[PDB]
Structure of Disintegrin rhodostomin:
Amino acid sequence: ECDCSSPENPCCDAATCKLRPGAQCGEGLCCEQCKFSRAGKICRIARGDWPDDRCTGQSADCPRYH
């Protein structure tokens, strides 16, 4: 299980396909520049006036209110 899909991705070690030391993530709706997105950053639009999903600060995945 690689953490990045492309060897062009600077978040991973070219030699391992896994995160470089200190990188929190390589991919995901709540990853930016190899770091978890800040808590509260919008990461998925909900239909209508339902609350949009937001990042946790602690994961690269966008959690669900639905």
